[PDB]
Design a protein around this nucleic acid. Sequence first.
DNA 1: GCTTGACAAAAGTGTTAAATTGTGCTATACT
DNA 2: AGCACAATTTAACACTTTTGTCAAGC
Lengths: 393, 98, 197, 302, 108, 50, 99
Amino acid sequence: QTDSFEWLIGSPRWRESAAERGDVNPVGGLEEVLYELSPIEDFSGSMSLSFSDPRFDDVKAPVDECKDKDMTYAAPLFVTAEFINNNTGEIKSQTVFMGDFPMMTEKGTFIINGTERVVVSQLVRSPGVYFDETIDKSTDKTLHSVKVIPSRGAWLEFDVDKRDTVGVRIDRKRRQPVTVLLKALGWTSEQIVERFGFSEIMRSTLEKDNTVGTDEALLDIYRKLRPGEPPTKESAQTLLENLFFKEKRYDLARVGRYKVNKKLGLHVGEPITSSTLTEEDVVATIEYLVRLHEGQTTMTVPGGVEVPVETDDIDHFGNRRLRTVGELIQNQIRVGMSRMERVVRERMTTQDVEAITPQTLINIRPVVAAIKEFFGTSQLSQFMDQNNPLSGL
Amino acid sequence: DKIHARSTGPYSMITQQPLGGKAQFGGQRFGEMECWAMQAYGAAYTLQELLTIKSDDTVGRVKVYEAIVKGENIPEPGIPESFKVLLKELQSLCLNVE
Amino acid sequence: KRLKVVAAFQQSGNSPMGMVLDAVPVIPPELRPMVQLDGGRFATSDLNDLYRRVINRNNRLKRLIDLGAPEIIVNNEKRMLQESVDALFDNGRRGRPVTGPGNRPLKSLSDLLKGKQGRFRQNLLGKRVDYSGRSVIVVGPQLKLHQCGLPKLMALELFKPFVMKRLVDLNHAQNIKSAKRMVERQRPQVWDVLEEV
Amino acid sequence: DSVRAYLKQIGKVALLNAEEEVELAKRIEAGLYATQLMTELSERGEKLPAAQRRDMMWICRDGDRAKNHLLEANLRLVVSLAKRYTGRGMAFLDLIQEGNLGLIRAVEKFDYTKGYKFSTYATWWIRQAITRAMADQARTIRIPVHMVEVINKLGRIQRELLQDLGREPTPEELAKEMDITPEKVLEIQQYAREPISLDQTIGDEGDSQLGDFIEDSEAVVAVDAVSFTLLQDQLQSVLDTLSEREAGVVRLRFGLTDGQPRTLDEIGQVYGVTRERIRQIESKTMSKLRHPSRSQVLRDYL
Amino acid sequence: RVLRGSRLGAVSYETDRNHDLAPRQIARYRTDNGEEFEVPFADDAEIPGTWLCRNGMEGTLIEGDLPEPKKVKPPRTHWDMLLERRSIEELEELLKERLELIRSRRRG
Amino acid sequence: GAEVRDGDILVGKVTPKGETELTPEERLLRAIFGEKAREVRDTSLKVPHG
Amino acid sequence: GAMLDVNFFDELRIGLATAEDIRQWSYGEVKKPETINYRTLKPEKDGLFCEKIFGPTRDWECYCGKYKRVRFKGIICERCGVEVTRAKVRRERMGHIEL
DNA sequence: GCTTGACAAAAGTGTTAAATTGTGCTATACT
DNA sequence: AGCACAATTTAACACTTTTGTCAAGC
Ligand SMILES: C/C=C/C/C=C(\C)[C@H](O)CC/C(C)=C/C=C(C)/C(O)=C1/C(=O)C=C([C@H](C)CC/C=C/NC(=O)OC)OC1=O
Ligand SMILES: [Zn+2]
């Protein structure tokens, strides 16, 4: 608990801590929230807000006193936030009181209103590229599949159909051919068979692709995705890229990207970032998938070391991550700041121009509300059963 | 922490019923397992008494209490309350009932 | 299939005309009580706002008809009304049921059904009767078969009516109230008459 | 979707413009004065000629048609306004309906000769009726509208002084702020205190309703009832322990026989004696009754 | 934890004297749809002919008294909302306006 | 430091109860006993059972 | 066939309720979506607690308070407009609504 | 046994005032 | 939102008669 908490802090304790084993960028969860939130800008792009320095203030009272007088042991929050108008460009830097923020005990617990709770760490299999071939016994054929479930994202399937075909159902759609993706991805049938020569179901489906030209695939995708909608040509790239590459509404975690590259040896020697996807990723995906439903042992993608050809497990720890305490806290922080920014941008225009200050722009009420409703009102924020030191631990 | 019994205490607000929960008095719920059971035994009067004069009979409760205080034969079990409640409900569901 | 219901009505002296509803009943308020707790912010019973919606829509569309309005909004309000009625009877059956604060669904009259077993026979869980006592159990190896141990403190509370009666029979408590407070006092002869009772 | 269904319904008609307003209003004016002169001849005024009848009724019908027409055209604006008030208290379609009603009222009381846009004069009645019905039917406990306004000012000033003070201000500060008394503020808040449901589970394991923990403090003690009974019993015994006119006077003075206590007036009436004779009576009676001899059994019932 | 309540009414407890009651009057009111509702009123009690009955509509007495039927007018008419804000002469102007309008319409 | 037992009084608290017509009987007991009304209701703290 | 429900129950027939039987049941039609005063804290006329339809919440106590004796019953204060009686028929009576 | 005259407190009585509350009203344009 | 006004409610208070009280003697 100490370490999750301090990292979320980003305390210099943790600073040297993570630095002990590489960790070129020691970043606290709050720092992450800043970088993932800043800047703050109007849709017109006329004006710009930003944050900096999530800095903790000392606690408002001692732990004994906080417990006794029933004041939840917390501490203030100051942020070097800054606004600038994109139209002309002028700094609006404030050190904003983000709110009083609870502080972990030295026994790793928390006191809410004098009450003493315990947060729990919750087990979850991480988001990742997940493989399986349930044999259609009625067909007596292994049905290799994949469901790459990202955070804050959409689903997708590369399925080994009963036919020698592609199970390219994506985002809960019901079915696709890979060719529609490739030409939609800017790939000719030439480019596909070039990239996929040993790809038998690929060549078969490309014979049964029954559609030619990129934009044909783009419009078919668009209509089947928004059925009950007029197809438009610019939405070809201006929807999918938003769906799966515009990393503002489709973003598996950084650890997700890490798991991806590590499973695939794609981003071999660089730190993890850019939760948006790449056609590189999808094509290596398809290659490994087909080879898995091909008879294989390991395949080295161009730029990637060969990954041993095999399935995946939801049960095995290698997928089953662990959302920690600071993890859940950052989740709440993100959900609060979402609402707060979507009201800042609201006022962002309605606020008077060249007369506002981020102080005029700021509302910490929803965030503090979320904080309170998390510490209280949560089956993960539970009462420390202190019947003895043992069971307490 | 576990020992607890009860005869008579604070009746309900929604229903007419003296509060369950060992924090308050509370007590023990004679439900489905040993009903079907009592029927198996064949003894009916005890079950009827339980489900009427210990369950819902508003007047009958104080009646029986009086009778015990006076040392006299038990009154007869009155009509259940939740019964009539369900009846009114079925009525108000636009249902010719009688 | 059709002839089933056809013969049902035919045989019956009933009338399918009643299937449409025109005049709506209402539950007694006591079963939907607006009960109070200590301080002024009282308690309610889930149906009140249903009836409120119904009354509001009815009065609205009434005065609408009174005015004379474009039939479009008339039909709109009527649809709203029928939706309201359906929510009342069993909301969440059709469309999406009706809202409040607190992420949690609705409860029509249909949901107040005690048994209300639909498609699964769950545990039953009735009303939790009176006049018992619970405890952990222990052996009575000295005891006879027909017997049973008993915490004297417990039964002490049990036979309170019996004991009070039998003791006021004795010249030990002038009124019943004397008996009850004496029970609170537990004057050991209380245990004596407890024996006989 | 009834919402989107009505949305498609309402998108079916297109908008209009200035001269639209012009001619439609003038048409409706013509129709109203037409029906006016119609009811003028409704009372005995004339054997109305055929063409005059036909085109006057036509003018009526036409003003009515354009009446519905413009309303239809502006329903889109109705929705465009009402969209921004939901997510709070009252359902959306009802808001729609009441905005429709306010549309009705405004278009009724609209002038073109002021040469404005219809929407401008509309918006007043629009948001008026909207917020009106908002305060009307957003609480299962109805509240006066001025009460609503003062509550709204209260909450406004509250968020204000929150972000200003940085914390929740003091109630005394607030009462100081809106220039009323603190207890007044308290009463306002309480009236502005919404009820809670009894259909949630207090336990995190959800099996017991919240209403399954409410002690009925106005329920029956019952044993108290039989206590009251035996009270009466020993009572009547003691009443018979003394003379007749005594107990008669007592029951009459306490309503012990009728539930209605009589005065010395009624008592000396029925007995034919003076009040003060009755007062002598009562004096000796309560003397006699106030004996430990008599009250030994009786004291217990307190 | 204890949580008590109380319905906002008083509950006394007398004995049910079926023999001794306040004597009382009985009335018959008629409705619009000729319904007859009958209410035991006190002996010392005025019998107001008007009464909204169990029907739920208003019901008058069995007898004929007729103190005042309505003594009240409608609230407004959109006629009136125009009349207050527009002249009778304006009215006649638009009237003959539309007269010639429909004329130079179909009948030119 | 005082010993206690279930049902005993914990804290002497009281509030007004309001006003209702007394029973004639209770009124009689007050009269014979010279006992006031004290409409404030007795709402104290007693230790629960056991 | 006895709504008072005293000890004698041969059969229990169910059926679809006629609108008449509905309107035959209720003692009045509520016509105000109102519950209780915020301030005096009492029911409202034509509201969902109107004792005029439902009955008194207070044993033998007319709304205006013109009577509070059980000797008064089977009667109604024309001013209060509710029948002095026991205070549990509210548990029984039903209200109706004409659409 | 009991009544008398007188006596003040109290229950109404009624008017007036204050407060309370339902209702209506607003005119750049904005679908 | 806020103001205007309007009916509606109630409470406040000034006065009156009524009832309980006394002290009296008879
Ligand atoms: C008026 C009836 C209309 C039809 C019935 C309906 C809609 C009910 O939905 C099903 C019947 C039912 C359940 C009603 C529950 C009520 C009234 C209530 O509140 C309870 C209750 O919840 C539990 C009990 C008993 C403890 C149930 C014992 C069952 C024994 N069965 C048996 O002996 O095996 C043959 O009594 C009640 O009055
Ligand atoms: Zn009354």
